[PDB]
């Protein structure tokens, strides 16, 4: 999307405990300045900055990766169950790249 270089929704499933400097982003609709630097070797790892939409499912586990897979299936499922307004391909299709 950097090679796009133009004008774009990108949704993103992860947990919040896995986000680098989670304490940087505490604040509700608040514009916390996330400087796009991480540690060279860190447990919690930075969400890619120019991706936009995020989920960040804080299940009470700080760090622990793998708390978004079932929720990914849930979102993907009911959007495919959501009737697309085109109604020519039934529900909005999903492509498993």
């Amino acid at each position: 999307l950097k090679d796009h270089a133009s004008k774009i929704c990108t949704i993103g499933i992860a947990p919040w405990g896995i986000v680098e400097n989670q304490e940087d982003l505490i604040g509700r609709d608040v514009v916390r300045p996330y400087q796009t630097m991480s540690n060279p070797m860190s447990k919690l790892t930075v969400l890619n900055s120019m991706h936009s939409h995020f989920i960040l499912a804080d299940n009470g586990t700080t760090g622990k990766y793998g708390a978004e897979v079932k929720l990914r299936r849930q979102l993907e499922k009911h959007i495919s169950l959501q009737k697309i307004n085109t109604r020519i391909g039934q529900g909005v299709p999903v492509v498993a790249l």
Partner: protein, 101 residues
């Protein structure tokens, strides 16, 4: 494949200093590749004030190729230019000459 790279990388790691110490060598050497990796490391410490100061040095040395990298670092030109900072750009004697005096 570039002993050029390896000499200056071992002269940086061998400098072993903070990044605003480093930039003032690598802008002087004009090597854009090595300040982009061995000084713009993913997590290299960038203390405030001296990145502003070396952005002031990057403008006056005509290092326009490092100017755009310091934009990608995030030196916003709104916050960077104070009244006295642009006054320092007008009152400097480095780089090329001009007819302004």
């Amino acid at each position: 494949q570039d002993i050029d790279l390896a000499i200056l990388t071992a002269l940086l790691k061998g400098a072993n200093a903070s990044a605003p110490d480093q930039l003032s060598l690598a802008l002087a050497w004009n090597r854009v590749d090595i300040a982009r990796s061995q000084i713009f490391i993913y997590g290299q410490q960038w203390p405030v004030g001296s990145l502003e100061q070396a952005m002031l040095d990057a403008l006056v040395l005509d290092r326009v190729d490092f100017v755009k990298l310091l934009i990608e670092n995030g030196v916003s030109m709104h916050r960077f230019l104070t009244i006295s900072r642009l006054e320092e750009l007008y009152n400097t004697r480095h780089g090329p000459s001009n007819t302004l005096y």
